[PDB]
Structures are given as structure tokens and as C-alpha cells.
mmCIF file of C-alpha atoms in Angstrom:
data_model
loop_
_atom_site.group_PDB
_atom_site.id
_atom_site.type_symbol
_atom_site.label_atom_id
_atom_site.label_comp_id
_atom_site.label_asym_id
_atom_site.label_seq_id
_atom_site.Cartn_x
_atom_site.Cartn_y
_atom_site.Cartn_z
ATOM 1 C CA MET A 1 182.959 131.557 168.224
ATOM 2 C CA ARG A 2 181.867 127.975 168.287
ATOM 3 C CA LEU A 3 179.059 125.832 168.887
ATOM 4 C CA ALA A 4 179.664 125.662 172.775
ATOM 5 C CA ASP A 5 180.128 129.653 173.280
ATOM 6 C CA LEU A 6 177.141 129.951 170.621
ATOM 7 C CA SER A 7 175.243 128.049 172.948
ATOM 8 C CA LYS A 8 176.348 129.174 176.367
ATOM 9 C CA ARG A 9 176.302 132.855 175.157
ATOM 10 C CA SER A 10 172.708 132.571 173.901
ATOM 11 C CA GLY A 11 171.649 130.557 176.722
ATOM 12 C CA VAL A 12 170.015 128.384 173.833
ATOM 13 C CA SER A 13 170.597 124.766 174.568
ATOM 14 C CA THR A 14 172.613 123.382 172.113
ATOM 15 C CA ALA A 15 169.957 121.189 170.498
ATOM 16 C CA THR A 16 168.042 123.983 169.790
ATOM 17 C CA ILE A 17 170.358 125.795 168.167
ATOM 18 C CA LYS A 18 170.588 122.487 166.050
ATOM 19 C CA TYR A 19 166.949 123.155 165.285
ATOM 20 C CA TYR A 20 166.905 126.544 164.121
ATOM 21 C CA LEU A 21 169.803 125.264 161.730
ATOM 22 C CA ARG A 22 167.568 122.800 160.142
ATOM 23 C CA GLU A 23 164.671 124.967 160.738
ATOM 24 C CA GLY A 24 166.261 127.891 159.000
ATOM 25 C CA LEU A 25 165.303 130.373 161.924
ATOM 26 C CA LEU A 26 169.445 130.108 161.691
ATOM 27 C CA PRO A 27 171.605 130.463 158.649
ATOM 28 C CA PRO A 28 174.239 127.810 158.016
ATOM 29 C CA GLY A 29 177.835 128.607 160.192
ATOM 30 C CA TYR A 30 179.510 131.286 163.683
ATOM 31 C CA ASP A 31 179.658 135.013 164.402
ATOM 32 C CA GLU A 32 178.553 137.651 166.096
ATOM 33 C CA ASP A 33 175.535 138.290 163.745
ATOM 34 C CA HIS A 34 174.801 134.368 164.319
ATOM 35 C CA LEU A 35 174.520 135.269 167.514
ATOM 36 C CA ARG A 36 171.866 138.258 166.709
ATOM 37 C CA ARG A 37 170.210 136.384 164.965
ATOM 38 C CA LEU A 38 169.731 133.664 167.824
ATOM 39 C CA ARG A 39 168.723 136.261 170.220
ATOM 40 C CA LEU A 40 166.079 137.684 168.129
ATOM 41 C CA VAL A 41 164.190 134.200 167.327
ATOM 42 C CA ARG A 42 164.590 133.841 171.449
ATOM 43 C CA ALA A 43 162.555 137.055 171.523
ATOM 44 C CA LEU A 44 160.406 136.424 169.025
ATOM 45 C CA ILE A 45 159.643 132.435 170.409
ATOM 46 C CA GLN A 46 159.860 133.426 174.444
ATOM 47 C CA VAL A 47 158.524 137.918 174.705
ATOM 48 C CA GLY A 48 156.508 137.733 171.382
ATOM 49 C CA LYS A 49 155.129 134.411 172.046
ATOM 50 C CA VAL A 50 155.022 134.083 167.805
ATOM 51 C CA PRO A 51 154.797 130.567 166.339
ATOM 52 C CA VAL A 52 157.781 129.104 164.453
ATOM 53 C CA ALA A 53 155.939 129.190 161.393
ATOM 54 C CA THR A 54 155.601 132.311 161.946
ATOM 55 C CA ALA A 55 159.039 133.832 162.985
ATOM 56 C CA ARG A 56 160.298 131.106 160.015
ATOM 57 C CA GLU A 57 158.378 134.002 157.420
ATOM 58 C CA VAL A 58 159.309 137.010 159.531
ATOM 59 C CA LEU A 59 162.948 135.774 159.444
ATOM 60 C CA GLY A 60 162.653 134.762 155.809
ATOM 61 C CA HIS A 61 161.197 138.384 154.821
ATOM 62 C CA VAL A 62 164.702 139.664 156.765
ATOM 63 C CA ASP A 63 166.870 137.566 154.651
ATOM 64 C CA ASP A 64 164.787 137.994 151.379
ATOM 65 C CA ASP A 65 168.190 138.930 148.800
ATOM 66 C CA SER A 66 166.217 139.465 146.551
ATOM 67 C CA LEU A 67 164.227 142.809 147.482
ATOM 68 C CA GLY A 68 165.839 146.149 149.100
ATOM 69 C CA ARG A 69 165.749 147.099 152.636
ATOM 70 C CA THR A 70 163.021 149.544 152.820
ATOM 71 C CA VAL A 71 160.635 146.703 151.675
ATOM 72 C CA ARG A 72 161.901 144.245 153.173
ATOM 73 C CA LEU A 73 161.306 145.702 156.275
ATOM 74 C CA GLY A 74 157.990 145.830 156.181
ATOM 75 C CA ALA A 75 157.529 142.793 154.850
ATOM 76 C CA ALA A 76 159.092 140.908 158.107
ATOM 77 C CA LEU A 77 157.194 143.396 160.166
ATOM 78 C CA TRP A 78 154.174 142.349 158.880
ATOM 79 C CA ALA A 79 154.376 138.771 158.743
ATOM 80 C CA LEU A 80 154.419 139.370 162.641
ATOM 81 C CA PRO A 81 151.386 138.185 164.056
ATOM 82 C CA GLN A 82 148.563 140.186 163.297
ATOM 83 C CA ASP A 83 144.598 140.376 164.867
ATOM 84 C CA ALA A 84 141.332 139.824 162.546
ATOM 85 C CA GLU A 85 140.285 142.276 159.617
ATOM 86 C CA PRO A 86 137.398 144.529 160.669
ATOM 87 C CA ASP A 87 134.146 144.660 158.818
ATOM 88 C CA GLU A 88 134.261 147.970 156.587
ATOM 89 C CA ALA A 89 130.718 147.972 156.061
ATOM 90 C CA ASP A 90 130.301 149.133 159.963
ATOM 91 C CA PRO A 91 129.615 152.355 160.404
ATOM 92 C CA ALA A 92 131.484 152.912 163.221
ATOM 93 C CA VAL A 93 134.940 151.532 161.054
ATOM 94 C CA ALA A 94 134.113 154.613 158.588
ATOM 95 C CA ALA A 95 133.829 156.721 161.722
ATOM 96 C CA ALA A 96 137.115 154.980 163.061
ATOM 97 C CA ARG A 97 139.505 154.919 159.820
ATOM 98 C CA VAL A 98 138.822 158.789 158.932
ATOM 99 C CA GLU A 99 139.642 159.781 162.694
ATOM 100 C CA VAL A 100 142.504 157.983 162.421
ATOM 101 C CA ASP A 101 143.762 159.417 158.897
ATOM 102 C CA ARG A 102 142.848 162.719 160.805
ATOM 103 C CA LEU A 103 144.814 162.274 163.642
ATOM 104 C CA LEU A 104 148.015 160.405 161.636
ATOM 105 C CA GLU A 105 147.857 164.349 160.224
ATOM 106 C CA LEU A 106 147.287 166.358 162.946
ATOM 107 C CA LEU A 107 150.847 164.379 164.230
ATOM 108 C CA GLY A 108 152.475 164.345 161.287
ATOM 109 C CA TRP A 109 153.060 160.480 160.567
ATOM 110 C CA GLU A 110 152.948 161.142 157.076
ATOM 111 C CA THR A 111 154.766 157.713 156.270
ATOM 112 C CA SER A 112 151.997 155.595 157.943
ATOM 113 C CA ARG A 113 149.620 157.723 155.727
ATOM 114 C CA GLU A 114 151.203 155.812 152.723
ATOM 115 C CA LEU A 115 151.443 152.308 154.360
ATOM 116 C CA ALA A 116 147.757 152.532 155.489
ATOM 117 C CA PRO A 117 146.791 151.362 152.660
ATOM 118 C CA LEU A 118 148.037 147.859 153.862
ATOM 119 C CA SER A 119 149.775 148.135 156.922
ATOM 120 C CA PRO A 120 148.082 145.821 159.574
ATOM 121 C CA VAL A 121 148.868 147.698 162.737
ATOM 122 C CA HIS A 122 147.074 150.873 161.003
ATOM 123 C CA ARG A 123 144.029 148.471 161.097
ATOM 124 C CA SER A 124 144.745 147.524 164.531
ATOM 125 C CA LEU A 125 144.504 151.131 165.151
ATOM 126 C CA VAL A 126 140.926 151.106 162.965
ATOM 127 C CA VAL A 127 139.372 148.392 164.891
ATOM 128 C CA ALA A 128 140.236 149.915 167.980
ATOM 129 C CA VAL A 129 138.886 152.816 167.912
ATOM 130 C CA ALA A 130 135.648 151.404 166.541
ATOM 131 C CA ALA A 131 135.382 149.123 169.319
ATOM 132 C CA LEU A 132 135.253 152.610 171.965
ATOM 133 C CA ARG A 133 133.283 154.329 169.471
ATOM 134 C CA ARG A 134 130.539 151.733 169.604
ATOM 135 C CA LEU A 135 130.427 151.593 172.862
ATOM 136 C CA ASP A 136 129.923 155.267 172.695
ATOM 137 C CA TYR A 137 133.046 156.644 173.964
ATOM 138 C CA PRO A 138 133.891 159.879 172.022
ATOM 139 C CA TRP A 139 137.756 158.320 170.480
ATOM 140 C CA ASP A 140 138.558 160.991 167.745
ATOM 141 C CA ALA A 141 141.790 162.467 166.408
ATOM 142 C CA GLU A 142 141.599 165.670 168.725
ATOM 143 C CA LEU A 143 141.686 163.306 171.757
ATOM 144 C CA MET A 144 144.449 160.925 170.647
ATOM 145 C CA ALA A 145 146.395 163.802 169.589
ATOM 146 C CA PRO A 146 147.982 163.662 172.814
ATOM 147 C CA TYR A 147 148.541 160.190 173.761
ATOM 148 C CA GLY A 148 150.210 159.303 169.993
ATOM 149 C CA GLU A 149 152.679 162.377 171.291
ATOM 150 C CA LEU A 150 153.388 160.043 174.672
ATOM 151 C CA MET A 151 153.900 156.830 172.825
ATOM 152 C CA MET A 152 155.945 158.434 169.964
ATOM 153 C CA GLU A 153 158.163 159.007 173.021
ATOM 154 C CA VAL A 154 158.021 155.848 174.044
ATOM 155 C CA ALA A 155 158.964 154.407 170.419
ATOM 156 C CA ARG A 156 162.073 156.684 170.795
ATOM 157 C CA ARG A 157 163.004 155.508 173.770
ATOM 158 C CA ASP A 158 162.642 151.746 172.844
ATOM 159 C CA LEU A 159 164.496 152.366 169.406
ATOM 160 C CA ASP A 160 167.538 154.633 170.779
ATOM 161 C CA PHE A 161 167.285 151.741 173.441
ATOM 162 C CA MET A 162 168.508 149.210 170.469
ATOM 163 C CA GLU A 163 170.191 151.667 168.718
ATOM 164 C CA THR A 164 172.985 151.642 171.762
ATOM 165 C CA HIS A 165 172.352 148.142 173.583
ATOM 166 C CA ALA A 166 172.573 146.306 170.423
ATOM 167 C CA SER A 167 174.492 148.797 167.652
ATOM 168 C CA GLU A 168 176.089 146.054 166.003
ATOM 169 C CA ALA A 169 172.638 144.906 164.872
ATOM 170 C CA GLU A 170 171.675 144.205 161.516
ATOM 171 C CA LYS A 171 168.967 147.092 161.123
ATOM 172 C CA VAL A 172 165.932 145.038 159.916
ATOM 173 C CA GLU A 173 166.691 142.679 162.559
ATOM 174 C CA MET A 174 166.625 145.191 165.349
ATOM 175 C CA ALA A 175 163.605 146.607 163.963
ATOM 176 C CA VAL A 176 161.890 143.789 163.970
ATOM 177 C CA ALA A 177 163.005 143.214 167.848
ATOM 178 C CA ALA A 178 162.450 146.405 169.234
ATOM 179 C CA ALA A 179 158.694 145.681 167.353
ATOM 180 C CA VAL A 180 158.142 142.443 169.701
ATOM 181 C CA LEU A 181 160.312 143.022 172.617
ATOM 182 C CA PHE A 182 158.728 145.787 174.601
ATOM 183 C CA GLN A 183 154.826 145.340 174.375
ATOM 184 C CA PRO A 184 154.864 143.096 177.551
ATOM 185 C CA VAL A 185 156.785 145.651 180.043
ATOM 186 C CA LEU A 186 155.132 148.896 178.957
ATOM 187 C CA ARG A 187 151.504 146.861 179.362
ATOM 188 C CA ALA A 188 152.543 146.196 183.146
ATOM 189 C CA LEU A 189 153.680 149.582 183.296
ATOM 190 C CA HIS A 190 150.474 151.070 182.072
ATOM 191 C CA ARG A 191 148.624 149.253 184.039
ATOM 192 C CA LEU A 192 150.622 149.997 187.288
ATOM 193 C CA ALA A 193 150.278 153.941 186.454
ATOM 194 C CA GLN A 194 146.795 153.207 186.343
ATOM 195 C CA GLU A 195 146.648 151.456 189.454
ATOM 196 C CA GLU A 196 148.921 153.667 191.324
ATOM 197 C CA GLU A 197 146.897 156.918 190.489
ATOM 198 C CA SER A 198 143.291 154.850 190.941
ATOM 199 C CA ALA A 199 144.625 154.870 194.677
ATOM 200 C CA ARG A 200 145.827 158.128 194.809
ATOM 201 C CA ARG A 201 142.374 159.250 193.487
ATOM 202 C CA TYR A 202 139.741 156.921 194.555
ATOM 203 C CA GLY A 203 141.370 155.043 197.189
ATOM 204 C CA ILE A 204 142.709 151.426 197.290
ATOM 205 C CA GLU A 205 143.969 149.378 200.396
ATOM 206 C CA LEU A 206 144.521 146.309 201.542
ATOM 207 C CA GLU A 207 142.698 144.871 204.471
ATOM 208 C CA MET B 1 113.674 154.657 182.703
ATOM 209 C CA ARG B 2 111.878 151.912 180.469
ATOM 210 C CA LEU B 3 113.531 148.206 179.511
ATOM 211 C CA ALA B 4 112.953 149.225 176.261
ATOM 212 C CA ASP B 5 115.144 152.665 176.868
ATOM 213 C CA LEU B 6 118.006 150.813 178.641
ATOM 214 C CA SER B 7 118.045 148.237 175.367
ATOM 215 C CA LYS B 8 117.781 151.042 173.081
ATOM 216 C CA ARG B 9 120.196 153.328 174.514
ATOM 217 C CA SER B 10 122.887 150.535 175.750
ATOM 218 C CA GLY B 11 122.678 148.718 172.346
ATOM 219 C CA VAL B 12 122.087 145.687 174.270
ATOM 220 C CA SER B 13 119.754 143.126 173.261
ATOM 221 C CA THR B 14 116.554 143.439 175.667
ATOM 222 C CA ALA B 15 117.555 139.362 176.100
ATOM 223 C CA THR B 16 121.286 140.044 177.433
ATOM 224 C CA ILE B 17 119.478 142.368 179.568
ATOM 225 C CA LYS B 18 117.307 139.871 181.682
ATOM 226 C CA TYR B 19 120.367 137.815 180.652
ATOM 227 C CA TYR B 20 122.449 139.764 182.678
ATOM 228 C CA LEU B 21 119.746 140.838 185.552
ATOM 229 C CA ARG B 22 119.664 136.888 186.564
ATOM 230 C CA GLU B 23 123.665 136.412 186.370
ATOM 231 C CA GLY B 24 123.727 138.941 188.807
ATOM 232 C CA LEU B 25 125.643 141.521 187.020
ATOM 233 C CA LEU B 26 123.065 144.328 187.134
ATOM 234 C CA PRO B 27 121.219 145.054 189.860
ATOM 235 C CA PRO B 28 117.443 144.812 189.887
ATOM 236 C CA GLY B 29 115.309 147.550 188.891
ATOM 237 C CA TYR B 30 116.078 151.808 186.029
ATOM 238 C CA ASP B 31 118.100 154.718 187.177
ATOM 239 C CA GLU B 32 121.089 155.881 185.201
ATOM 240 C CA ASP B 33 123.091 153.716 187.173
ATOM 241 C CA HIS B 34 121.065 151.039 185.683
ATOM 242 C CA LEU B 35 122.872 151.962 181.973
ATOM 243 C CA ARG B 36 126.786 152.910 183.417
ATOM 244 C CA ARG B 37 126.378 149.769 184.991
ATOM 245 C CA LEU B 38 125.262 148.010 181.744
ATOM 246 C CA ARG B 39 128.315 149.899 179.730
ATOM 247 C CA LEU B 40 130.777 148.607 182.538
ATOM 248 C CA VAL B 41 129.617 144.762 181.400
ATOM 249 C CA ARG B 42 130.039 145.564 178.020
ATOM 250 C CA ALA B 43 133.247 147.378 178.270
ATOM 251 C CA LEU B 44 134.289 144.559 180.478
ATOM 252 C CA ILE B 45 133.282 141.828 177.666
ATOM 253 C CA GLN B 46 133.705 143.517 174.514
ATOM 254 C CA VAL B 47 136.927 145.356 174.831
ATOM 255 C CA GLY B 48 138.449 143.415 178.066
ATOM 256 C CA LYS B 49 137.572 140.130 176.477
ATOM 257 C CA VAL B 50 136.654 139.361 180.523
ATOM 258 C CA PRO B 51 135.052 136.192 181.053
ATOM 259 C CA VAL B 52 131.376 136.532 182.381
ATOM 260 C CA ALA B 53 132.001 133.978 185.884
ATOM 261 C CA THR B 54 134.757 137.223 186.059
ATOM 262 C CA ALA B 55 132.713 139.709 185.399
ATOM 263 C CA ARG B 56 130.733 138.121 188.153
ATOM 264 C CA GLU B 57 133.339 138.463 190.515
ATOM 265 C CA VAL B 58 134.355 141.945 189.217
ATOM 266 C CA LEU B 59 130.941 143.114 189.880
ATOM 267 C CA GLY B 60 130.540 141.127 192.992
ATOM 268 C CA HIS B 61 132.976 143.056 194.676
ATOM 269 C CA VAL B 62 132.132 146.873 193.433
ATOM 270 C CA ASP B 63 128.564 146.081 195.006
ATOM 271 C CA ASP B 64 130.421 144.513 198.347
ATOM 272 C CA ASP B 65 128.153 146.310 200.706
ATOM 273 C CA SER B 66 130.614 144.880 203.811
ATOM 274 C CA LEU B 67 133.738 146.551 203.160
ATOM 275 C CA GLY B 68 134.733 150.149 202.503
ATOM 276 C CA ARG B 69 135.425 151.311 199.225
ATOM 277 C CA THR B 70 138.837 151.115 199.384
ATOM 278 C CA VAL B 71 139.504 147.883 199.956
ATOM 279 C CA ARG B 72 136.866 146.613 197.815
ATOM 280 C CA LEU B 73 138.475 148.574 194.782
ATOM 281 C CA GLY B 74 141.380 147.093 194.863
ATOM 282 C CA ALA B 75 139.130 143.354 195.415
ATOM 283 C CA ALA B 76 137.175 144.123 192.242
ATOM 284 C CA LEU B 77 140.421 145.362 190.262
ATOM 285 C CA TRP B 78 142.306 142.289 190.917
ATOM 286 C CA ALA B 79 139.541 140.149 190.434
ATOM 287 C CA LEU B 80 139.762 140.775 186.779
ATOM 288 C CA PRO B 81 141.960 138.503 184.557
ATOM 289 C CA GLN B 82 145.876 138.313 185.223
ATOM 290 C CA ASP B 83 148.797 136.813 184.647
ATOM 291 C CA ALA B 84 150.306 134.106 186.328
ATOM 292 C CA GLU B 85 152.417 134.492 189.037
ATOM 293 C CA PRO B 86 156.753 133.916 188.532
ATOM 294 C CA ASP B 87 159.542 131.225 190.198
ATOM 295 C CA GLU B 88 160.428 133.375 193.247
ATOM 296 C CA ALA B 89 163.384 130.838 192.955
ATOM 297 C CA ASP B 90 164.544 132.234 190.081
ATOM 298 C CA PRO B 91 167.430 134.376 190.293
ATOM 299 C CA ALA B 92 165.835 136.468 187.413
ATOM 300 C CA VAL B 93 162.826 137.065 189.048
ATOM 301 C CA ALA B 94 164.566 138.371 191.836
ATOM 302 C CA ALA B 95 166.859 140.586 190.515
ATOM 303 C CA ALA B 96 163.617 142.206 188.717
ATOM 304 C CA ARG B 97 162.041 142.033 192.265
ATOM 305 C CA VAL B 98 164.815 144.323 193.322
ATOM 306 C CA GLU B 99 164.734 146.749 189.912
ATOM 307 C CA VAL B 100 160.930 147.340 190.350
ATOM 308 C CA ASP B 101 160.772 148.421 193.844
ATOM 309 C CA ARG B 102 164.232 150.612 193.301
ATOM 310 C CA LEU B 103 161.982 152.052 189.795
ATOM 311 C CA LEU B 104 158.870 152.815 192.263
ATOM 312 C CA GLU B 105 161.121 154.297 194.768
ATOM 313 C CA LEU B 106 162.634 156.652 191.781
ATOM 314 C CA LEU B 107 159.035 157.258 189.970
ATOM 315 C CA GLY B 108 157.520 157.898 193.837
ATOM 316 C CA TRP B 109 154.894 155.127 193.518
ATOM 317 C CA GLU B 110 154.855 155.333 197.467
ATOM 318 C CA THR B 111 151.185 153.924 197.760
ATOM 319 C CA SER B 112 152.198 151.009 194.841
ATOM 320 C CA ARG B 113 155.014 149.910 197.199
ATOM 321 C CA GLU B 114 152.460 149.524 199.936
ATOM 322 C CA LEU B 115 150.582 147.068 197.701
ATOM 323 C CA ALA B 116 153.249 145.308 196.020
ATOM 324 C CA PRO B 117 152.600 142.228 198.068
ATOM 325 C CA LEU B 118 149.437 141.239 197.191
ATOM 326 C CA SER B 119 149.093 143.504 193.713
ATOM 327 C CA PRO B 120 148.764 141.528 190.846
ATOM 328 C CA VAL B 121 149.768 144.041 188.610
ATOM 329 C CA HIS B 122 152.315 144.893 190.707
ATOM 330 C CA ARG B 123 153.217 140.902 190.043
ATOM 331 C CA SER B 124 152.880 141.275 186.114
ATOM 332 C CA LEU B 125 155.853 143.981 186.067
ATOM 333 C CA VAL B 126 157.926 142.004 187.813
ATOM 334 C CA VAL B 127 157.639 139.384 185.430
ATOM 335 C CA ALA B 128 158.077 141.359 181.943
ATOM 336 C CA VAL B 129 161.448 142.560 183.450
ATOM 337 C CA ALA B 130 162.784 139.007 184.292
ATOM 338 C CA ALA B 131 162.154 138.347 180.856
ATOM 339 C CA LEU B 132 164.082 141.192 178.962
ATOM 340 C CA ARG B 133 166.859 140.723 181.578
ATOM 341 C CA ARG B 134 166.497 136.911 181.183
ATOM 342 C CA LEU B 135 167.541 137.841 177.254
ATOM 343 C CA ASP B 136 169.982 139.801 178.871
ATOM 344 C CA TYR B 137 168.939 143.423 177.996
ATOM 345 C CA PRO B 138 169.706 145.580 181.059
ATOM 346 C CA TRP B 139 166.615 147.124 182.401
ATOM 347 C CA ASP B 140 166.884 148.652 185.751
ATOM 348 C CA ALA B 141 165.505 151.275 187.327
ATOM 349 C CA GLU B 142 167.206 154.289 185.832
ATOM 350 C CA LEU B 143 166.464 152.824 182.512
ATOM 351 C CA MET B 144 162.166 152.440 183.251
ATOM 352 C CA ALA B 145 161.599 155.249 185.245
ATOM 353 C CA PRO B 146 161.289 157.880 181.603
ATOM 354 C CA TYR B 147 158.580 155.123 180.804
ATOM 355 C CA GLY B 148 157.001 155.325 183.804
ATOM 356 C CA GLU B 149 156.372 158.779 183.797
ATOM 357 C CA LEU B 150 155.008 159.038 180.408
ATOM 358 C CA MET B 151 152.810 156.126 182.052
ATOM 359 C CA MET B 152 151.597 157.583 184.408
ATOM 360 C CA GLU B 153 150.771 160.751 182.591
ATOM 361 C CA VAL B 154 148.950 158.791 179.960
ATOM 362 C CA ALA B 155 147.232 157.021 183.300
ATOM 363 C CA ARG B 156 146.158 160.221 184.573
ATOM 364 C CA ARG B 157 144.535 161.355 181.092
ATOM 365 C CA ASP B 158 142.801 158.180 180.733
ATOM 366 C CA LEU B 159 141.546 159.558 183.997
ATOM 367 C CA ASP B 160 140.735 162.636 183.570
ATOM 368 C CA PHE B 161 138.726 161.263 180.271
ATOM 369 C CA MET B 162 137.027 159.150 182.852
ATOM 370 C CA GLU B 163 136.047 161.667 185.416
ATOM 371 C CA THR B 164 134.754 163.864 182.574
ATOM 372 C CA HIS B 165 132.635 161.616 180.473
ATOM 373 C CA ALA B 166 131.394 159.803 182.700
ATOM 374 C CA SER B 167 131.330 162.079 185.658
ATOM 375 C CA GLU B 168 128.252 160.688 187.122
ATOM 376 C CA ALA B 169 129.270 156.940 187.618
ATOM 377 C CA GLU B 170 130.443 155.509 190.689
ATOM 378 C CA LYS B 171 134.194 155.876 191.435
ATOM 379 C CA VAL B 172 134.622 152.144 191.836
ATOM 380 C CA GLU B 173 132.433 151.052 188.321
ATOM 381 C CA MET B 174 135.009 154.088 187.331
ATOM 382 C CA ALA B 175 138.095 152.694 187.909
ATOM 383 C CA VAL B 176 137.374 149.074 187.063
ATOM 384 C CA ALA B 177 136.540 150.348 183.338
ATOM 385 C CA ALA B 178 139.563 152.472 182.970
ATOM 386 C CA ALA B 179 141.519 149.428 184.004
ATOM 387 C CA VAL B 180 140.338 147.254 180.852
ATOM 388 C CA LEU B 181 139.037 150.146 178.440
ATOM 389 C CA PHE B 182 142.029 151.551 177.318
ATOM 390 C CA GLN B 183 144.707 148.834 176.283
ATOM 391 C CA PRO B 184 143.991 147.777 173.292
ATOM 392 C CA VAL B 185 143.895 151.488 172.031
ATOM 393 C CA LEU B 186 146.997 151.967 173.818
ATOM 394 C CA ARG B 187 148.962 149.033 172.482
ATOM 395 C CA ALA B 188 147.788 149.669 169.043
ATOM 396 C CA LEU B 189 149.168 153.506 169.035
ATOM 397 C CA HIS B 190 152.358 152.317 170.830
ATOM 398 C CA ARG B 191 152.784 149.410 167.991
ATOM 399 C CA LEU B 192 151.918 151.935 165.273
ATOM 400 C CA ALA B 193 154.563 154.843 166.576
ATOM 401 C CA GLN B 194 157.135 152.464 166.566
ATOM 402 C CA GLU B 195 156.412 151.589 162.852
ATOM 403 C CA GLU B 196 156.444 155.184 161.935
ATOM 404 C CA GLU B 197 159.815 156.070 163.385
ATOM 405 C CA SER B 198 160.494 152.607 162.267
ATOM 406 C CA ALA B 199 160.043 154.023 158.890
ATOM 407 C CA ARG B 200 161.726 157.406 159.293
ATOM 408 C CA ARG B 201 165.525 155.819 160.685
ATOM 409 C CA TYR B 202 165.391 152.549 158.824
ATOM 410 C CA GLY B 203 162.847 152.962 155.865
ATOM 411 C CA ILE B 204 159.624 151.403 155.289
ATOM 412 C CA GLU B 205 157.817 150.838 151.744
ATOM 413 C CA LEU B 206 154.974 149.357 149.888
ATOM 414 C CA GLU B 207 156.341 147.806 146.788
#
């Protein structure tokens, strides 16, 4: 493939590409892997709202050849924008941590229990649960279990999609993309589902 | 109930309460409805990240006695923070609108099809889908149907929860709270589910 083919197929200006080349986001030359990389960059920036500097670190891990892939994927994923860390001293945070671990135990997400010490995603769940309990909403393991199963089915669908639509993409690249690509549409679907159901149960009309 | 009871039971400083009183967010006096209102205010601000000025408009609709409840609920919900409007001229937006309508048709969300002209939530789905298609991901009605069903089950669970835990809450108040209360924990659960599944399929380890 040529530069023109790369630009026209990616929808990315022939300038922005040269910019990504010198920014390190795109390896120097152009095969289908160069294109897929570009697509990932656009997904990170456009949909993920990820800063260029941050995207550079993420891709750096994706391209790290000094570590095995299992470690690289973790590094790349956790290099993505994350939330603030909680106050472990907060009694609400402690209770939330216990509930979350019981939840992973109930759901059988054993791998997550092992990554838990460093996973910023695990931490965000802990933080979210602590906020609800602080407002006195009894969100515990048993109550979250059904939600977890549902979200797992969503996750399986995201990845099944990636695995087919982008079947030739490098794995780490695929996983990183899936981690930011579907949040906006999933949030929208959930918000609209609540609206639809709220309309059925309580009633919503236009004037 | 007294002022002290109200403050101690709500976890809201006796000052912030007086502030909400003069800000119009809390009706003047204190019954269980005053408490529930306060809880809603805290949920909007703490979890929903809703500005005070915005919360004031939302509650104004909740307390609007010149309109029937079905219209008030819509007004209150859509007064909540929303996303930017799309460029209808964009061919990607047009295609997204068609896909979304086909989706609601497939899912049987007829009420949403009627509120569609003004629903900012409907619009956000349209906007999200257009972004994916712009990146050439074939997200269409048929592909979204399964996700919609899953999210509907999540929605039913949120409301079933509200209906029991806060069974005595005024309906509009309940629906508005449910609309912002569970987004953070649901996002966390989904992100963690993807991480867990990504670990199983591709491999993630700590160093």
C-alpha cells in the first residue's frame, strides 16, 4: 500500500499521518498493520478522547518487545486514562473493597482477583460502589452479581465482534481498542433503555 | 422530623441544607419527603456531577404543578446534562438515524420512537452510532438489538431496585435519580468485565 492508499482508506489526512509517524504513534514504513494501527489511533483519540501523549504511552506498551504479551497488554490497558484513587482510610471504601472481592468470587472472575492489587479498573469499581454506599444505597456483592453477568455478556459480544470484524488485527491492539471503543454507545443504549422503561412504568409525553 | 434529624440522617451539613433551602432545591419546611429530596440532590451533585444551577431547573420541573406528571418527568429528565447536537448534514448522522429507528422498531421501544423528535438521549445514541460508523465499524440495527435487550434488563433491574429500596419516593423523583445514579457503577462493571474477558482470551499478567 502507498501513502495515498493509507490516507484515503483511513480517512486520516496525509498530514496527520506524517504527524503520527514522527510522534511515534505509527511505526515507520505500508501494510494492513499500518492501517489497523492508524484506525486504533483514531479510535483512541476520537472515541476514547485520549490525549496524544497518553496514546503514545499506550502504543509504546503495545510495541514493547522486551516483555511478553501478557504483561504488555496489562501495561497498555492501564496506561489508558483512569480515575482518581480512593481514600483507603474511608470506611466506605473498605466496605466497598470487601463487597467487590465477594462479587468477583461469586462471578468467578478469578483472574481479576489476581490483578486486583494493581488494576485501575478494579479500583474504579471500588470507587463507584463506595459512592453509592456513602449515599446509603445497599449495593453489595449479591445485588451486583446479576449486573456483572449481564455486563460479561456485553463484553463477550464486544470481543466476538472485534475478533471477526478485525480478525487480522494484532491481539493487544484489538483488546486496547475494545476497551475504549464501545463505552459511548453502551452508555447511550443504557440511558435510552432507562428512558424507555421509565416511560412505560411512570409515563413520559411530549407537550 | 427536626433540622438535626434531617442533617444527621442525610449526612448533609446543616449549612448546605439551609443553602439548598434558599437555592430552591429543597422545599421549605420536615417530613420523609424533605429527606428524599435531599438525597436526590446529593445524588445529582455527587454521583451525577450535575451543576447546582442545572439541578435547580431539574427539580423545578419535578415541582412544576402547572403540568401533568407525564410531561414533567420528560422535562425534568431532559433538563439533566446532555451531549452536543450532531450535524444532521453529515451523511454518517443520517445513516445512524435510520439504524437507530430500525433498532427501536426491532426492540419494540415504541414510546422512544414517539419521543425521538425531542429526546436528547435518543440523540446521544444517534451521535454515538455515527462516530462508530465514521470509523467504519458496521454498527447497525441488527447488531445493536442484542445489546439493547441486555441494557433493557439492566434498566429493569435499576428501577426494580429503586421501586423497593425507595418505595415511598415520589415517582418523578425516583426516575430522575435512577437516570444518573447507576452510570458510574455500570461503566465500571462493564470495563472490568472487558478486562476479565480480555484476560481469559488474550492474557494479562502482573510482572
